[PDB]
C-alpha cells in the first residue's frame, strides 16, 4: 500500500507513535517518507547481505527473519514479510523496539541525515489526525 | 518460509504444477532452487528498477504490483508481497500465467541457464510427493 502523507500520520497516531520515546509524529512521518516513500512494500538490499523492509525500512540483521541473512537475529519475532503488509501494526511494533534500543531515531540513517533538526512539524500540517 | 526440497515439490504438485504446460515437476523445483534457494521471502532488485519476489522470483514489471516500478503492469492482479507468503498459492497461480505467456519456462532466466536440458528428475527423487 502506498500511503498518503496525512493517511500515514493518522495510522501512526492510532498505532501509538505520536510522542513515542519523545519523538513527535512528524519525526516518524518524515522518516517513513525518506525511507520508503510511504510504500509498505519497499525493500532495499544492503551491501552486508541484509535487507530493509517496509515503510520504515526495518533491517533483517537484527529485527526480522527473512531466512537469508547469515548470523542474524529476529528481535521483533516476525517474518520480514509481515513488515510489507498494508496493515502497519507489525512495522510500528517493531519500530517501538528499535527506537527504545539506545540510539533513539538515529537507528534510521535517513532520519538522522534528512529529518533530525528540521521542521518535522511540517510533515503533519494540514492533517486531520 | 524456507522449504525443504521434497516439501516444496509436494506443495507444487498439490498446487497443480506437475506437468503444467508440459513441464515436469523437477523443472519447477530446479527453477525455485536457483531463483530463491527455496525461500519464499527472497527479493532481488533488478537494474531496471523492477524487483523479483518469492520462490520463483516473479518480476514487478509485468506480474505484480509493488508501487515502485514505473510503467508496470500487474497481470496476476496481486500485490507483490503476496508472493512472499509461506503459502505458495499466489506464486503458483501467477507462475501458471507466466509459463503460458509464449516462452514457456524460458521466462525464468535461471531455468534456461541452469535447469533446461539437465536431469531435472533428480530434483524430485527420494520424495514422497
Ligand atoms: Cl499495494
Ligand atoms: Cl493497496
Ligand atoms: Cl495497491
Ligand atoms: Cl491504522
Ligand atoms: Cl487500524
Ligand atoms: Cl519467521
Ligand atoms: Cl514465518
Ligand atoms: Cl516462522
Ligand atoms: Cl494501518
Ligand atoms: Cl491497519
Ligand atoms: Cl488500518
Ligand atoms: Cl532519544
Ligand atoms: Cl519465515
Ligand atoms: Cl516460517
Ligand atoms: Cl521461519
Ligand atoms: Cl501446499
Ligand atoms: Cl496447501
Ligand atoms: Cl496491489
Ligand atoms: Cl494491495
Ligand atoms: Cl490493492
Ligand atoms: Cl504452500
Ligand atoms: Cl499452503
Ligand atoms: Cl501448505
Ligand atoms: Cl513450452
Ligand atoms: Na534476521
Ligand atoms: Na507491477
Ligand atoms: Pt494494493
Ligand atoms: Pt491500521
Ligand atoms: Pt517463519
Ligand atoms: Pt500449501
From Swiss-Prot, chains A, B:
Any GO MF annotation of the entry: identical protein binding
Membrane-spanning parts: none
SMART domains: LYZ1
Superkingdom of origin organism: Eukaryota
Pfam families: Lys
Disulfide-bond pairs as recorded: 6-127, 30-115, 64-80, 76-94
Catalytic activity as recorded in UniProt: Hydrolysis of (1->4)-beta-linkages between N-acetylmuramic acid and N-acetyl-D-glucosamine residues in a peptidoglycan and between N-acetyl-D-glucosamine residues in chitodextrins
Primary location class: secreted
Classification via SUPFAM superfamilies: Lysozyme-like
Keyword Kinase tagged: no
Active site: 35, 52
Gene Ontology terms: biological process: cell wall macromolecule catabolic process; defense response to bacterium; defense response to Gram-negative bacterium; defense response to Gram-positive bacterium; killing of cells of another organism
Ranges for domain C-type lysozyme: 1-129
Tissue specificity note: In the egg white and polymorphonuclear leukocytes.
GO cellular component, one term: extracellular space
Alphabetically ordered keywords of this record: Allergen, Antimicrobial, Bacteriolytic enzyme, Disulfide bond, Glycosidase, Hydrolase, Secreted, Signal
EC numbers, comma separated: 3.2.1.17
Binding site for substrate: 101
Location within or outside the cell: Secreted
Other noteworthy facts: Lysozyme C is capable of both hydrolysis and transglycosylation; it also shows a slight esterase activity. It acts rapidly on both peptide-substituted and unsubstituted peptidoglycan, and slowly on chitin oligosaccharides.
Family per similarity comment: Belongs to the glycosyl hydrolase 22 family.
Complex formation: Monomer.
Role this protein plays: Lysozymes have primarily a bacteriolytic function; those in tissues and body fluids are associated with the monocyte-macrophage system and enhance the activity of immunoagents. Has bacteriolytic activity against M.luteus.
Official protein name in the record: Lysozyme C
Amino acid at each position: 500500500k502506498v500511503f498518503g502523507r496525512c493517511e500515514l500520520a493518522a495510522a501512526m497516531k492510532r498505532h501509538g507513535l505520536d510522542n513515542y520515546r519523545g519523538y513527535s509524529l512528524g519525526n516518524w512521518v518524515c522518516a517513513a517518507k525518506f525511507e520508503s516513500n510511504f510504500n509498505t512494500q519497499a525493500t532495499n538490499r544492503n551491501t552486508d547481505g541484509s535487507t530493509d523492509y517496509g515503510i520504515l525500512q526495518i533491517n533483517s540483521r537484527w529485527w526480522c527473519n527473512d531466512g537469508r541473512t547469515p548470523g542474524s537475529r529476529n528481535l521483533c519475532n516476525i517474518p520480514c514479510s509481515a513488515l510489507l503488509s498494508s496493515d502497519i501494526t507489525a512495522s510500528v511494533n517493531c519500530a517501538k523496539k528499535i527506537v527504545s534500543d539506545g540510539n533513539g531515531m538515529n537507528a534510521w540513517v535517513a532520519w538522522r541525515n534528512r529529518c533530525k533538526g528540521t521542521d518535522v512539524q511540517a510533515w503533519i500540517r494540514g492533517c486531520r489526525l
